[PDB]
Design brief:
GO terms for molecular function: metal ion binding; peptide transmembrane transporter activity. The chain has 513 residues and is an alpha+beta fold. The chain has 17 helices and 21 strands. It is globular and about 75 Å long.
């Protein structure tokens, strides 16, 4: 039996199937599922973590690698040192075909990742973790600079995959470490058979997997097409699952014989409008409140996302474990009469910048910007919409009247922890980095956030994130707009489909009826 998956990744959906991590995320829970780490404990001072490693775990036996030992603490030490930046030949992230033995690179490669891909760089794992050492072949010690109860969240995310130190040694000695990411060796339930870049990956079941064996032996991840093309293939049965489809075309493209279902999950993402506090008028709370009240966020959500999203009246996404502190109402929601009364008199002329990129939190940012512009017109505010790139946001402007008053963007993360969701976008530490578009600095907010990582006690973290969120919703440095669902379609014959909040799925639980 074989299944073809047409994927949006074209998030690496592949790397989650061939590599394991120390822990996995369980949905809506702060409790981590032990995976390659079977248990842990935290020292009294919160600065030392002991990881007890699982025994009997094998790396893949592939055409390019025969392992002579089981997974152990050297694999963990090697992997976590790579992602803390400390491997000097290898990118911090598994990529493929990019390697550093080059003068004008790594400085360039990491700078462009940081400007283009700010999600990973926002983690600052090398500012949190001081060292990783083997205490024995099945125990690892992680030493922190300071207590941070969000650290394990990161070790359960896509970046914290576990590679083979033995493979990486065999490669170094044959100076060929470029092949680490081209010919993968993992512990996961699938292994790579072959691939053609931008076309397909073929995966084959790992017959020596340490946990429940995968049910489908052969999977092909098709990367060869665009978003509309995935449904064209789906309905011509060239794939049995297609992720992130364009739902507005299902009606045109479906054929009336195919049995299929749509499945969706709440996502760890948020589309928002940020106010620039470098602008004196935007520092006026009465103007922020009134602008928020002009916007019919309900209508915007319906028009832009066609029932694949939910209005965000909170900063913390519903899928977080922390969402127990969310409340359904928003003080500054749609109230066009009050908005007009406050604003029309000021004769405001505002600059609304829109980052020109495609992210799952917003499929049509310029369309949304026109609707925002229109709603603000009804309250007596004129808006100029401008397209900007992230490099352009690094530039400084002579005329500060050319600079943005409002900017349309969003945020996403690869785990459920509020720390790595709200800190990058709203903390004083990031005020001069690209993640804090508000250029906002509130010390009381940073104190709630710093408090939330000093303790591991669930109800205590929750209490701190409740204070932090109420403060953000009162001060309005940003206006929350939408949390966007992750969506796929599958053949009715396919079961065991479980889409994660980060846009991936576990291939190993799929089966045909």
């Amino acid at each position: 039996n074989g299944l073809t998956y047409c994927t949006h990744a074209s998030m690496n959906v592949v790397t989650e199937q061939i590599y394991n991590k120390l822990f996995d995320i369980k949905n809506h829970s702060a409790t981590l599922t032990p995976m390659l780490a079977q248990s842990y404990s935290i020292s009294a001072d919160g600065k030392e973590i002991l990881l007890n490693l699982r025994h009997g775990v094998k790396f893949h036996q592939t055409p390019w690698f025969t392992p002579t030992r089981d997974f152990n603490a050297e694999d963990v030490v090697f992997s976590i040192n790579r992602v803390l930046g400390h491997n000097t030949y290898l990118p911090t992230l598994a990529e493929a075909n990019v390697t550093y033995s080059n003068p004008q690179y790594r400085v360039f490669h990491e700078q462009a990742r940081k400007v283009r891909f700010p999600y990973f760089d926002s983690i600052k794992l090398n500012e949190k973790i001081k060292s990783v050492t083997a205490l024995s072949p099945y125990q690892v010690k992680i030493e922190l600079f300071a207590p941070d109860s969000s650290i394990l969240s990161h070790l359960a995310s896509q970046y914290a995959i576990i590679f083979s130190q033995e493979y990486a040694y065999q490669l170094s000695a044959d100076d060929n470490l470029a092949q680490l990411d081209t010919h993968p060796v993992g512990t996961g339930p699938y292994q790579v058979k072959d691939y053609v870049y931008n076309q397909y990956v073929r995966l084959v079941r790992n017959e020596n997997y340490w946990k429940k064996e995968a049910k489908i032996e052969h999977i092909i991840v098709d990367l060869s097409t665009d978003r509309s093309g995935r449904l064209v293939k789906f309905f011509n049965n060239e794939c049995q699952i297609a992720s992130y489809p364009e739902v507005s075309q299902i009606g045109l493209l479906k054929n009336d014989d195919k049995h299929y279902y749509m499945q969706s999950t709440d996502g760890m993402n948020l589309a928002y409008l940020a106010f620039n506090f470098d602008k004196p008028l935007m520092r006026d709370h009465e103007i922020r409140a009134a602008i928020s009240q002009s916007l019919n966020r309900a209508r915007i959500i319906h028009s832009i996302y066609h029932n694949t999203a939910t209005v965000a009246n909170n900063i913390i996404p519903e899928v977080s474990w922390a969402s127990t502190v969310n409340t359904p109402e928003f003080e500054f929601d749609y109230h066009p009469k009050i908005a007009k009364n406050k604003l029309a008199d000021k004769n405001l002329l505002l600059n609304l910048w829109v980052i020109n990129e495609e992210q799952v939190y917003n499929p049509a940012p310029f369309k949304m910007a026109e609707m925002i512009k229109w709603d603000l017109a009804q309250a007596g505010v004129k808006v100029k919409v401008r397209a900007v790139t992230r490099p352009f946001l690094t530039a400084q402007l002579r005329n500060q009247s050319e600079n943005y008053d409002l900017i349309l963007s969003g945020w996403l993360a690869g785990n459920l922890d509020p720390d790595g969701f709200m800190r990058p976008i709203l903390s004083c530490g990031t005020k001069n980095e690209l993640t804090n578009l508000s250029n906002w600095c509130n010390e009381e907010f940073d104190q709630f956030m710093d408090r939330a990582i000093t303790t591991s006690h669930l109800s205590s973290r929750a209490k701190a994130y409740n204070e932090a969120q109420e403060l953000v919703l009162r001060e309005l440095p940003i206006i929350p707009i939408a949390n966007v669902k992750r969506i796929l379609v599958a053949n009715s014959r396919v079961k065991g489909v479980k889409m994660t909040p980060f846009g991936s799925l576990d291939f190993s639980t799929l089966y045909f009826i």
